[PDB]
Design a protein around this ligand. Structure first.
Ligand SMILES: Nc1ncnc2c1ncn2[C@@H]1O[C@H](COP(=O)(O)O)[C@@H](O)[C@H]1O
Ligand SMILES: Nc1ncnc2c1ncn2[C@@H]1O[C@H](COP(=O)(O)O)[C@@H](O)[C@H]1O
Lengths: 278, 278
């Protein structure tokens, strides 16, 4: 077994190397003046079992195409098994045809990964885990809930765990139950004793921050002592970070499935969670 | 039969509609705040034969992923046959493994297009036509030589046609012979009566413009009255346009397999050449 780090690992390839004590081989990668990607897999692999680490955060399209290229190269170079660890899988929000003739993006991406030679696919908090049925090989989903629980407990004195919609309830519950905290969810259509408590709003993804902002209102208008926001994938887009500080979200918790900053942001390294699931 | 225009047609979908008198359906496409692509195929297609127009010029990776998404959607929507007209095919320069463990990018791209549902692939001046053997369906290569010949004859009084390397010779010969002009090629290693003639340097692609600049020297140092440069794919990168004016390339001739400008650049619409080859 060896670990091959793609063009987009967020330290995950290196820390997985320590944790598992497996040798680490880094993919050579540059950008032509064209704009196109150069990809070279710099070792022998002849009969090795490979753990490819390639996340597909921004830029999603280039990182995806780089993933495709690296993957075929690896299968071409003799590898015995390809395991693709893609922390943030792109085009996940596109689950189905919301209107007729819309593309089911995640289907295409997944089909493409079977072709191209990926045997086992490992993903952290897929937006909706049924999605991954499209992938023909073996699936290993990673829910880094314990690591998020542990962090919340360190940072938050008297936590109430609030999920922004029914979608996020299962995740809130499993996180809150491990830390024996109270939990609830906001009910779109037309517990609650979060009065005076330190609320933590947890979602899988935070892009614009719209759902989290609407949720931060209800919280304060219900006696929230403070509001903290947490997601596995922090794809903060344009306003986001500021749009949240303005509504009074003090702290931001995310993980390294994505690339980020540090005025804040509390970044959990989810390699430990990924290692278990291997 | 119908024509579906992707997110990147350069008028080619529209003019192919006139030329062939086939109805034109445009793909709905936007960019999420994410960065990700939205793709919707807005008509019925149930049993239609489709002509998809998607070029893959910059940004190559997004356009490729958009191509993949649109393609599967079309096959999913019932279409009887998918013909993908991709004027400029990206990752063409990556023909083979120039070093061990390099990716054969074009192989991956092509394999991906077979999977995904493309039956027939139509390409204009592929960098090297053996490349396309990797594609499993039917191939239609388009060499728009007659349209380039016609244009040269309109604009250039007393043309000499110069190919920058032996690679570009076949193309120079076929273009020059149709216009009964003299032709030659520059010989790397360590006719020629272009003395006093209006030289036209023809290549498949112009990126940085390096090969064209070295060739413009020999020309002037051999009595060239003037130098014009022509390529099918004008991917002018950074300096390029200026780097050429400086060495005295007066005129630039390209085609609409790519998107461009017009201080210059003489742009041939190669839809007519694509139509023949259908
Ligand atoms: N990358 C993206 N960014 C923003 N919205 C998206 C994205 N992908 C899909 N959507 C839309 O989000 C809606 C689903 O909501 P949700 O998946 O809960 O955010 C669908 O109507 C999609 O069209
Ligand atoms: N998009 C690109 N831009 C610039 N050079 C490239 C590109 N793709 C491949 N190459 C390199 O160009 C060399 C082949 O030369 P040519 O194909 O004649 O330009 C190979 O060694 C490739 O590594």
């Amino acid at each position: 077994m060896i670990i091959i780090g793609g063009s987009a690992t967020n330290g995950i390839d290196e820390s997985l190397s320590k944790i598992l004590s497996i040798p680490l081989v880094k993919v050579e990668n540059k950008i032509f003046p064209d704009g196109e990607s150069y990809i070279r897999v710099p070792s022998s692999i002849r009969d090795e079992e490979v753990l490819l680490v390639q996340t597909t955060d921004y830029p999603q399209d280039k990182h995806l195409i780089e993933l495709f290229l690296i993957a075929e190269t690896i299968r071409d170079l003799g590898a015995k098994k390809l395991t693709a660890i893609v922390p943030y899988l792109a085009y996940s929000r596109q689950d189905r045809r919301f209107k007729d003739g819309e593309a089911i993006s995640i289907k295409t991406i997944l089909h493409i990964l079977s072709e191209v030679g990926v045997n086992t696919l490992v993903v952290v908090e897929p937006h909706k885990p049924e999605e991954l049925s499209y992938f023909k090989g073996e699936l290993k989903i990673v829910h880094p809930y314990h690591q998020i629980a542990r962090k919340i407990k360190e940072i938050i004195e008297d936590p109430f765990i609030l999920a922004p919609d029914r979608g996020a309830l299962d995740r809130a519950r499993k996180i809150a139950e491990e830390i024996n905290a109270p939990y609830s969810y906001i009910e779109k259509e037309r517990n609650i004793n979060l009065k005076g408590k330190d609320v933590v709003i947890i979602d899988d993804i935070i892009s614009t921050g719209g759902t989290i902002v609407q949720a931060t209102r209800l919280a304060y208008s219900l006696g929230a002592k403070s509001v903290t926001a947490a997601a596995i994938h922090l794809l903060l887009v344009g306003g986001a970070k500021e749009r949240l500080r303005e509504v009074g979200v003090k702290t931001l918790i995310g993980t390294n499935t994505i690339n980020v900053n540090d005025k804040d942001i509390i970044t959990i390294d989810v390699s430990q969670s990924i290692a278990l699931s291997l």
